[PDB]
Nucleic acid binder design. Structure first.
Lengths: 73, 72, 105, 50, 246, 90
RNA sequence: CACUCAUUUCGUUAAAUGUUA
RNA sequence: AAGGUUCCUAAACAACAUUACUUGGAUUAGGGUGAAUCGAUCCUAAAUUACAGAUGGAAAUCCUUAAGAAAAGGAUUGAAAGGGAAUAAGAUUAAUAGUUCUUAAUCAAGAGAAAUGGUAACAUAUCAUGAACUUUAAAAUGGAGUGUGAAAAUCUACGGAAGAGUUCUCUUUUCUUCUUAACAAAAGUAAAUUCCACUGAAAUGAAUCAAUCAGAGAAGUGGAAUUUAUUGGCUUUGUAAGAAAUUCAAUGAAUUGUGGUAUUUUUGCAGUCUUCAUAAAAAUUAAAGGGAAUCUUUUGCUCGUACUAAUAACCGCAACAGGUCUCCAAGAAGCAAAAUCUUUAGUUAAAUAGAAUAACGCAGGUAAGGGAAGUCGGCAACAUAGCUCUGUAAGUUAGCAAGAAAGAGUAGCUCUGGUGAUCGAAUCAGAACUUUAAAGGUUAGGGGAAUCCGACUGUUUAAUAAAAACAUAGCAUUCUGAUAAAUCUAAAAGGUUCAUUACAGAAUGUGAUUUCUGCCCAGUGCUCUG
RNA sequence: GAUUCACGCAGUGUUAACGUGCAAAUUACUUGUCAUAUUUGAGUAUAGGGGCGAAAGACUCAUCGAACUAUCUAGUAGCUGG
């Protein structure tokens, strides 16, 4: 597992076709966008709800998205 | 301590099974069999061991090919 | 305290059977397997440990980057800077001495 | 031992297979004298020596 | 009777040399053209402790006379040799400590070591700690020279026999008194199995010719002929003299 | 601290007065420092029997068993030097 | 007595031996 | 390792486990052992064995790279404790699990005229070519003792959340949980060591527990590198809370701070000491010198894997008080991993019991007065015993004797003082008062005066002898120049000391140190340059 | 190759227990020793007129002043028994 640091690199990950799945985990303070790629699982810790919504919109519609909360699937 | 006590450390095999004669007579460190006289090409037989000759010799086994050749 | 067991079937505390007992989830402790401590590179002349090269197992040098297993200098990774500096002075001063002593003195 | 050669394990399995009694139907054959297998052994009674 | 310990030593089962950590064979380089008619230069890279022998060994590196590469040697270090030194082997080598010269090039009175008994056999005599041979005289009529062995005997060798100039390092090793049986035990760590020596008188008649009776005594003269068979050749053999000499 | 048994005090009372006195002289020389012949620093220390290493100067020298240079090897060095002069000059 | 040619003991990567130039 | 199905379940109890058994390691029938990452496989060690050759009447022996038209250099085997490419957490089964499942990784083998920066030490998500050949380094190296970095466990300070225990006597109380992997990241920040630049130290400085270091250049200032149980040591971050732990409700909800100049274990590091001891190799990997030539995806074969590992699974005829190699390791108390008691875990069964309370026993004790008078002999038992202070003789190899011998003190409670850093450590000293006057529950030297033997540490007759016997260091003698001495073999380009070379190899006697080794060469040996 | 305690090991004494034993050599207490001439596993080497032995004729699979096993062998017996 690797972590992307700022908002720019994460977008290029969803823009690229290498993506396989996306899981969004909402915590009591932040929300993590975990992009399941071929080799690694990249994650972005978004602490701003406004920028979280922007990242949710940028997800391609043909990919599976899992929304996680206090209860795991 | 040469009796009961000294037998506690006996957990290393001198002999294992032999590939040619099937008996637990293959000396590991000597690398030869004490019963059939392995890698030696000739089977180990002695005239003083008359019983050992009648325990493993011709006719003591299946005789898979020779049982047909002689009767033919 | 929590007592542990070996995971592999090596029952003796040899050099390759080093372990570390670390804490895991729920309070129980698991057994790791720790690497052996390795030496580094030495200068071929003075036998001093070379700088800029990590002390890892020999097969792990292949995994490193190209620049991480040498120094960007002549005889880098086999000779110290003091080892090299004397090689340069030996080469130049002996040849210069031969030029004047012999070779049309 | 846990560690063993492949052919040694198969000879251990054969000794397990041979440690069985006469089946019931065999005992009802006419002119039958084989009721108990006398080549039987147990781990705590006789060591098979291999 | 039984077989004495001297007989059991010749089979070499537990009495084999404990030569596992030894550096190697210490000798001169094989004689070639460049050392018969010229000189080669060798660098003393390091000085090491060879297990089982009292003198240090030198790792000399000659470059190569004919091919490309190195020629790693292993000399018996002469006293005064140091790391990084240049030593020379050859007929025209200078008379300096550590150089290897033919014995005929050494002036009379020269002190040499690691002398060859036969030319090209890579050193025989004067190889233990602090030991040396002295050149006595030369004889150009038959190309032979006379040297004095460390035991005092004189030997006549071919003039082209090779030797190293100087003293073998490590002298005075035997002048230090061993004090403990443990120290003597460690001395034979890289040597044969000989140390704890049971006296023959302390044995039984089956074990030894000295194996005594009710009193620990030999009973017969201890000076024996050289023609005594093994198993009875115990004591002093062909003793010309005997006792505290005056 | 001790009147006369200085370094052989580690032996206690169990090897004889003379044997302790003979080895006392050797052990003092064996564990002493010597002047480096190349850099003149009192830094040469024995590592193994016959091997003397010069600490702050980086030289390995072959020498005596318990001293840097034996008296027998000292005369030999002077003997060879004198013999070489005679050969060089006539 | 002189030699080597069987014979002995060796050494090497059988790596400039012997005679001229 | 050894055993070999003893493992798990169900039915069943004739025999077996010195009574009995509904129990069982016993009877019957089924079930059970899942690997690219753990091992074997691979490499070599001591050593072992081939073809050809050498030797032998023979069987066969020798040689292992020397003898060879064999093998760029030398063949086979030899380690489940040595070397070694790469996997972790949680869950799961009646039983297997670094092996299955979930999630997340890693490794190997594949497929899709040749760069910059820094003065320098040296540094740049592949970058930025690098053949033959050669070299270097790694794999890969004893032990002791001291100091110290980090982690874990234990203890503890602050702040709580949740549950439990005691509670007519108190106790803002006692207890339990508050966790997190492989592999990677790089907010913040360490200890140690080695180098580099500036400058040039004497009125000599720098420093350590100890040392040790400096004009072949100290200290100071500023830098570079490496080590610290994976990336980069620690906190922190991704994995990752969605797991797990502790609770509550009837699947759903709650929480999961921060510290310590404390002890122990583990793991590194730094210098010190010690050797007539210097304390493996190969597979395999990287770098250098040289300058010839011009992100996605696939696969990962074979074998072991159950169970015991012992007061019942092993070896002793057995469920034998015997023997048998290791890993992890809580509290009290103490110098202590001692004796004693307890927590987690395991167990209450381990060749049957009940009544009675004779003799004589086996094991454990006590005793008036006397105190070895017993006895071959203080055998056995008693006795002394921890710590602090005072004190300690003859003799002596001057090191010791020595814990000599001998004497005084020691409890509980209430206080004071000393030993540090910019709040904390148990340690030491002293002073009041009280008592049954204090090491003693457990643990825990009896001492002195002589003589004999062996100098000392050590070894020995497994199963009646542990010693004065053997060894030992010291001393002394003998032979030997290596084609030798000793010596194995029937023989041998055969073998051992010998990878050796007189400060060595081989054969002997006496047995540390001090003092001394007297006279005898007729006899028997040995020797002669006759 | 100092003195001691502990984990371990041994075997000084009781000439204790037991002596048709827990045991074809063990148990208890006392005692000694308890890392460098130390302890110990696995691998490996040495074989019967041989090996190995800090030496006791000790050890070499409960067998050692010459192992075990088989053959010569139904060895011979002026001696004992029937």
């Amino acid at each position: 597992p690797k972590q992307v640091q700022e908002f720019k690199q994460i977008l290029k990950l969803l823009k690229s076709g290498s993506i396989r799945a996306v899981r969004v985990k909402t915590n009591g303070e932040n929300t993590k966008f975990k992009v399941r790629c071929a080799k690694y699982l990249y994650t972005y810790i978004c602490a701003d709800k406004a920028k979280a919504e922007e990242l949710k919109k940028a997800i391609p519609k043909d990919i599976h998205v899992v929304e996680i909360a206090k209860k795991a699937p | 301590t040469k009796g009961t006590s000294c037998r506690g450390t006996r957990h290393n095999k001198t002999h294992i099974l032999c590939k040619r004669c099937g008996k637990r007579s293959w000396h590991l460190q000597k690398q030869r069999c004490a019963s059939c006289g392995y890698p030696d090409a000739k089977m180990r037989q002695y005239a003083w061991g008359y019983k050992a000759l009648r325990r493993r010799t011709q006719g003591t086994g299946r005789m898979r090919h020779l049982k047909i050749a002689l009767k033919r | 305290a929590v007592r542990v067991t070996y995971v592999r079937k090596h029952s003796y505390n040899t050099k390759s059977n080093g372990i570390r007992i670390v804490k895991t989830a729920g309070g129980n402790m698991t057994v790791q397997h720790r690497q052996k401590i390795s030496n580094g590179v030495r200068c071929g002349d003075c036998g001093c440990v070379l700088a800029g090269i990590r002390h890892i197992r020999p097969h792990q040098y292949g995994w490193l980057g190209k620049s991480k297993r040498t120094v960007t200098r002549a005889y880098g990774g086999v000779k110290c800077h003091k080892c090299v500096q004397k090689k340069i002075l030996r080469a130049f001063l002996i040849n210069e001495h031969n030029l004047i002593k012999l070779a049309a003195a | 031992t846990g560690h063993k050669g492949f052919s040694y394990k198969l000879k251990l399995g054969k000794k397990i297979h041979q440690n069985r009694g006469v089946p019931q139907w065999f005992r009802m054959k006419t002119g039958n004298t084989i009721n108990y297998n006398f080549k039987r052994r147990h781990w705590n009674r006789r060591k098979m020596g291999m | 009777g039984r077989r004495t310990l001297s007989q059991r030593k010749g089979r070499g089962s537990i009495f084999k040399s404990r030569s596992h950590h030894k550096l190697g064979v210490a000798q001169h380089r094989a004689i070639d053209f460049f050392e018969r008619h010229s000189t080669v230069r060798g660098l003393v890279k390091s000085i090491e402790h060879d297990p089982g022998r009292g003198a240090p060994l030198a790792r000399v590196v000659f470059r190569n006379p004919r091919q490309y590469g190195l020629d790693k040697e292993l000399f018996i270090c002469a006293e005064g040799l140091y790391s990084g030194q240049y030593i020379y082997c050859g007929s025209k080598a200078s008379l300096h400590i550590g150089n290897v010269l033919p014995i005929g090039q050494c002036p009379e009175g020269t002190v040499v070591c690691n002398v060859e008994s036969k030319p090209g056999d890579r050193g025989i005599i004067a190889r233990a700690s602090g030991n040396y041979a002295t050149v006595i005289s030369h004889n150009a009529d038959n190309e032979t020279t006379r040297i004095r062995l460390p035991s005092g005997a004189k030997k006549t060798l071919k003039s082209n026999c090779r030797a190293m100039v100087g003293i073998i390092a490590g002298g005075g090793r035997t002048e230090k008194p061993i004090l403990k049986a443990g120290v003597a035990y460690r001395m034979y760590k890289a040597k044969r199995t000989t140390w704890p020596r049971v006296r023959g008188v302390a044995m039984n008649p089956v074990d030894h010719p000295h194996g005594g009776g009710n009193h620990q005594h030999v009973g017969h003269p201890t000076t024996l002929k050289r023609s005594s068979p093994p198993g009875q050749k115990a004591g002093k053999v062909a003793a010309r003299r005997t006792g505290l000499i005056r | 601290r001790t009147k006369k048994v200085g370094i052989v005090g580690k032996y206690g009372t169990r090897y004889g007065a003379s044997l302790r006195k003979v080895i006392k002289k050797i052990e003092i020389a064996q564990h002493s420092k010597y002047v480096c012949p190349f850099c003149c620093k009192e830094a040469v220390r024995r590592t193994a029997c016959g091997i003397w290493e010069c600490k702050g100067c980086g030289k390995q020298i072959a020498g005596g068993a318990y001293t840097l240079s034996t008296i027998s090897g000292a005369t030999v060095r002077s003997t060879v030097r004198r013999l070489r002069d005679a050969k060089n000059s006539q």
